[PDB]
Design a binder for this molecule. Structure first.
Ligand SMILES: O=C[C@H](O)[C@@H](O)[C@H](O[C@@H]1O[C@H](CO)[C@H](O)[C@H](O)[C@H]1O)[C@H](O)CO
Ligand SMILES: O=C[C@H](O)[C@@H](O)[C@H](O[C@@H]1O[C@H](CO)[C@H](O)[C@H](O)[C@H]1O)[C@H](O)CO
Lengths: 134, 133
């Protein structure tokens, strides 16, 4: 399972959509979508979106100065081992909207300034069919 | 069956309209409108008009009964008989129209986003889902 990692040197603005399509492997534990503020390991994360099949939860968080913030959890787990999925992460002036399947799943208010985002990473236990940034 | 639904407080950067459907095999043309009201030929902040009969996709606005300058996208990323997915994505500068897996055209705003009040989808199109995110 090849991870995705791509630079956003120009940044992301309100009205940016990240579309992720793929499949949860039948033996999956967890996977993640990070919007990061730099290339280096331990860089701050404006958004860490972490569907957790092993603990039946989807955790949202940020990271600054090597420390994770307050966790937010979405309602239920709209993911299943062995099943394909589609996620939109939509940036607005107020935060990130996570859409899974046909419904908004959770809204994550900005903690870091949106202007600090310059990298998108998708990895973990996930088979990626397509990642695109519009 | 056409779609028509209200956006009573307008929209904002980060508003996404997702349309999934199918172009009938004898289709001539269909439309996606973002309108600023309900009565009249209300002002159109966005008129997105795939035209299978004339092989063009036209974008325009309408204000006080008059159409703006037409913009056309590159090619026609729709086909008679084929299913499609469109995203119309509002930013502060304009609408990003995504068709299939690629941005198709960027339409800079002529009307303010706050004035949008209605989404209408119709014409020769079969609609599986229309969602505003
Ligand atoms: O069960 C609740 C805990 O609060 C748990 O969530 C935390 O897990 C980390 O959470 C991070 C984002 O918060 C990130 O995903 C990292 O990978 C996870 O180890 C703890 O540190 C380890 O128990
Ligand atoms: O190139 C051809 C013309 O410029 C043509 O495209 C215009 O057609 C209208 O275009 C509107 C959007 O501009 C909208 O689709 C409307 O319904 C259409 O009648 C003309 O006014 C028709 O004489």
């Amino acid at each position: 399972n090849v991870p995705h990692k791509s630079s956003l040197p120009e940044g992301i603005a309100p009205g940016t959509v990240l579309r992720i399509r793929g499949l949860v492997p039948p033996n999956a534990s967890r996977f993640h979508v990070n919007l990061l503020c730099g290339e280096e390991q331990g860089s701050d994360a404006a958004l860490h979106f972490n569907p957790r099949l092993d603990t039946s939860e989807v955790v949202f968080n940020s990271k600054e100065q090597g420390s994770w913030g307050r966790e937010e959890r979405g309602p239920g787990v709209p993911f299943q081992r062995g099943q394909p999925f589609e996620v939109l992460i939509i940036a607005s002036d107020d935060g990130f909207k996570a859409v899974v399947g046909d419904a908004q799943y959770h809204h994550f208010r900005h903690r870091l300034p949106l202007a600090r985002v310059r990298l998108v990473e998708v990895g973990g236990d996930v088979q990626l069919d397509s990642v695109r940034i519009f």
